[PDB]
Amino acid sequence: KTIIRVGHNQSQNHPTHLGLLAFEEYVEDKLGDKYDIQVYPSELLGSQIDMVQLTQTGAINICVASNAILETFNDVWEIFNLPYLFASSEAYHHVMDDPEIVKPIFESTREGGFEGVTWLDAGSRSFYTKDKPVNSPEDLSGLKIRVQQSPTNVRMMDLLGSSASPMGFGEVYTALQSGIIDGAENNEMSLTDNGHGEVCKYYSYDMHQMVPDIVIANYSWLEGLPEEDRKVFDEGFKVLNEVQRKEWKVAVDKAKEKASEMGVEFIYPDQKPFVDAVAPLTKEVLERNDKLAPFYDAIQKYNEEYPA
């Protein structure tokens, strides 16, 4: 058979793994005599940055990468990394499901060896810290906060009066434990599935970003598929999206409960001071990249249709 290698950086219990297992089962049920889909969880194929590069060369076929890091491969991905971009999770989901918005973005990096085929839900990202609770941006002053390898997020930390420490997701637990960083920012699953709540017990819902995870496929590989095979893989990507999103809802609820049981304290800060502190980032990003405005306009229509 033809081996299709698929990587991601999450545990085997995470929604993304469950979605990819559904993908594998869907495709192999229709075409199993021909393809063996192999899913490599928990950074078995490397950190996310490692995997995107392996996808570019075709050493693996498909991987999952946070939108945060894709902006370094093509600047148009920056659009979904803007802080306080979406008014509501409903606005966000409708945006990511709108082909007129996502297709031009997903296809932007074909010359770099890959294209986006779907997205996966990763909730919203908020600050969590070890020693001191975050109630407003000034509480981040003098802290070192881990972010993804994303110039947008580095700039966001600068505007918050803080300092960014970019590193891969698998490094964060030990970096927190050793005191190399003071905190990080993510959805609630980081606390439980990745153990960050063992060290960080203050989780403050500033909800600065809703950053999609993107499923990317090697472009030569994908376009090389025979018509009928491509149709099955495409259907599989839709199943992946659907199963991951359903499982995400379940998992994030369980994560919140388990975090509480672990001793994490959830804080609900006033978001306005965070919004105002990082507003210049959106102004700067839009001014520098004129590809973005029409996507931003379209997102605003969804914000209006699905407000908070």
Ligand X SMILES: O=C(O)[C@H]1O[C@H](O)[C@H](O)[C@@H](O)[C@@H]1O
Residues at the site binding Cl ion, with contacts judged by CB under 5 A: 47-49, 168
Q: How far is the CB of 230 from ligand X (least distance, A)?
A: 26
Question: Binding to ligand X by residue 213, rule CB under 6 A?
Answer: yes
| 36, two tokens | 């063996």
Q: Which parts of 7-46 interact with ligand X (CB under 6 A)?
A: 9
Q: How far is the CB of 210 from Cl ion (least distance, A)?
A: 20
Nearer to ligand X, 210 or 232 (CB): 210
Contact 102, 116 (CB under 8 A): yes
Smallest separation, CB 102 to ligand X (Å): 17
Q: Which is nearer to Cl ion, 49 or 154 (CB)?
A: 49
Q: 5 a known binding residue?
A: no
Minimum distance of ligand X from residue 90's CB (angstroms): 20
126 binds ligand X (CB under 6 A): no
Q: Which does 49 bind (CB under 5 to 8 A by kind): ligand X, Cl ion, none?
A: Cl ion
Nearer to ligand X, 148 or 204 (CB): 148
Coil, strand or helix at 263: coil
Residue from 148, 152, 162, 303 touching ligand X (CB under 6 A): that is 148
- Which residues are bridge partners to 185 per DSSP? 127
CB of 186 closer than 8 Å to CB of 207:
no
Nearest distance in Å: CB 50, Cl ion: 7
Q: Which residue has the tokens 């306005």?
A: 272
Instruction: Rule CB under 6 A: say whether 191 interacts with ligand X.
Output: no
Q: How many CB atoms lie within 10 A of CB 239?
A: 18
Helix (H, G, I), strand (E, B) or coil at 201: coil
CA pseudo-torsion sign 204, 298, 113, 226 = positive
Of residues 40 through 59, those in contact with ligand X by CB under 6 A are 48
Among candidates 61, 66, 65, 70, which has minimal Cα distance to 24?
Answer: 61
Ligand-binding annotation for 125, yes or no, is yes
Q: Can you tell me whether residue 134 is helix, strand or coil? A: coil
Tokens of 116: 């986006």
User: Which runs of consecutive H residues, i.e. helices, occur in the chain?
Assistant: 15-31, 48-57, 67-70, 89-96, 99-106, 151-159, 172-178, 189-192, 219-224, 227-262, 272-288, 293-305
Annotated binding site for beta-D-glucuronate: 9-10, 48, 125, 146, 186-187
Annotated binding site: 9-10, 48, 125, 146, 186-187, 213
- Note the residues at the interface with ligand X (CB under 6 A): 9, 48, 66, 122, 148, 169, 186, 190, 213
